[PDB]
Subunit: 246 residues, 4 copies
């Protein structure tokens, strides 16, 4: 009673921020149909946890600790992965953080850390991988953005700027890489489970669906985009938010 | 080597404009996972053809002739379908036409027929069906629009107006029906196969993917939206255009 | 202490639905800088009222009764206007109605009347006028849509469909007419003054600006778009909503 | 034969990247209706040039050299400006650069410099100024983005990411500052004059208007947004591109 996503043969996927939530469910679901799923988490403990969960189901997976906010460090991790794997066919850029505050109160580090972690990081991770995808003439790049990147949100000028940036990145790369059978798309989740009970009720009262979404629902959308039959979807932003913001 | 879309148990789908192209592929693909697929085409000959194709594969299907541009006629067809079927869980509003012309030359009937067929029709088909979905607390409504409904197009002021209207319809209904476990979304295809060879080459030269899409690709997206695991996607427009217009 | 909009020399403007609200303020403000403002209202009494108001300030204005929902009637009114005036340089398509109801309860006439009045009418009014603009190589067409045409709204599936359609019309015509120095743009107002006090407070509580907009504010935007210096703005939708829906 | 933009009484405007092009025309046009226009350019020579041009017309203007890509330096410049001026009522964030390259060839510094200059800079410039606007309960913040921030562009993954980020920033701040009578909007220019003649012809052939826009046209839009009567326009992106991308 679940969908099956055929992603092609002998494929390797790489998911950043795979230690928890959406990233973790994406890595676990991709494992059902790709030959090997690489998990990157800030700490080795975090990725080992998800890699173990994936392996316990009989699938192949490996994990590398990597802090995407540190360009030299993450660049080395990706280089290492590419020496071990000739190709990385599916890349899910999910790593990201929030450092919320009204703009008037926001600290310079809250602004910088969110932009650096959520946006600047895409270059260091995606460039080496895209080079291999171009050479192999195949790829699926899925960038996790947020509905806040489309609408803005009180207390999140930094997060919104970063996630809107993810969308501009996505569209430009789609234009450049599509001729090589590479699709580049973004997923913009709304309120996904995993805040005071009163604020949560306030939020849910604004969602037509009447509930928050689940990380498994987001993973379904990411695996659909990673599949073989989604090759004509390119440069788009797919919002999964229960009707919060049509 | 294909995706499998679990759409739930004992489901009935209805696809309009099912006689050819996108509509036909959507009806055929839905048949792989729904209990019964109802096909509506302008002529009984057209729907019998697709119903026969679906049945030849061992699936259940029935067909009703119905001209969506004639409100009294299509309203009766839908009423008949609902007397025979208690529920229609998935509705794909695909029927539509084009009557191209530069605005300066466009005839009043070219304007009227396209709006009436492509937009006014949605009310007569969707209202009775949505009443059953609300009572049953379940539904998937997929409206086929077009990238032209988002960007406009020379020679298609009528088509663009109609397809943009489909999107406004989609978003309003998503807001009203989501609490009853009904999702309402639109698919906006770009250039899908099925024009002079020179104009076709001109078009393809504007598509990053370097080719037109196939009706089977559009059907994959419609079946994904019809699936059980896409219940949190609501009120959205999903563009499938090979990167033509990010 | 007000803006001045230079709209060119010897210009004639035509505003539909000029009898009240936004339409009335647009006609009055355009009068400050165009040579003649033609007002169309459903009844002769309504347009005479605004024409008198405009004339009382020393400006030139004339009025024609015309029901935009009746194609034969409005087509004759426009033909008459064009026999009296060689050119109509600025056209503001503002006429429109609402017939609100949840989709489940909506009557066929509520659906039809709103689409016919708000969308089908654009063809009969704009086509003859655009022919003169093309011949004269100059024009400003401003179509009033609504934020509901962009986001959808509970109880307004008909209005939203119609106003989204206005946007598709706008973009297609912009593509076709821009080479003739004609701009075609839409204005999408949010909540504009002119509902229970409790629902109004509920609405205002959702507007960052903390108040409804005024018809004079919408008129300022329409006159800016009608001005000489806005010739490079084309095929766009300008939302004036106090931040209600970024 | 020009528009007049009433921007209120005793207002002070600040324009970054005021040394040439769009920024220069915005500063010059604002000077016609604000009491004092502050110009910031990377070099003191550049801003002195525009300040002299503005003063030669009888208006008040001052200039400060400031490199927006250097956070400590630009933060000090803004602090200095705010010690000299109690209020800065209008802020036009126009400073920005391009460092074009296909993603595969792009250098890490080309990615970093564009994001740092075009996006990270907004925090250091806008935060101190917004604090004064909140205290004074009045403001106009206009952020210059680009159509590339909406559509992406081959060879500009860095620029597109930065300019899309500007839009996310704009929408979040609009939500936070609107209650204090502060509007925050973005302008997304298309191809503005000031490339091989063949590529330029190729570009112009894609613009319905059949020409590039002028910096004076962009300035008109910025001054309209800075005016008193545009207080209900908030959190929007206004595209000025001759119909290039509806």
């Amino acid at each position: 009673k679940e969908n099956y996503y055929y992603c092609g043969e002998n494929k390797v996927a790489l998911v950043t921020g795979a230690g928890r939530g959406i990233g973790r469910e994406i890595a676990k679901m991709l494992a059902k149909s790709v030959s090997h799923v690489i998990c990157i988490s800030r700490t080795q403990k975090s990725c080992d946890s998800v890699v173990d969960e994936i392996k316990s189901f009989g699938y192949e997976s490996s994990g590398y600790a990597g802090d995407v906010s540190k360009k030299e460090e993450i660049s080395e991790v990706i280089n290492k992965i590419l020496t071990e794997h000739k190709n990385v066919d599916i890349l899910v850029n999910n790593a990201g953080i929030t450092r919320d505050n009204l703009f008037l109160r926001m600290k310079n580090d809250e602004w910088e850390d969110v932009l650096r972690t959520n946006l600047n990081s895409l270059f260091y991770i995606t460039q080496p991988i895209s080079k291999r995808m171009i050479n192999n003439r195949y790829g699926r790049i899925i960038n996790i953005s947020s509905i806040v990147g489309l609408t803005g949100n009180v207390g999140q000028a930094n997060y919104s700027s970063s996630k809107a940036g993810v969308i501009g990145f996505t569209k430009s790369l789609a234009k450049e890489l599509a001729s090589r059978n590479i699709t580049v798309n973004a997923i913009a989740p709304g309120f996904i489970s995993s805040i005071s009970e009163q604020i949560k009720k306030n939020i849910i009262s604004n969602i037509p669906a009447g509930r928050m979404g689940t990380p498994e629902e987001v993973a379904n959308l990411a695996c659909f985009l990673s599949s073989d039959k989604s090759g004509y979807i390119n440069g788009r932003v797919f919002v999964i938010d229960g009707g919060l913001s049509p």
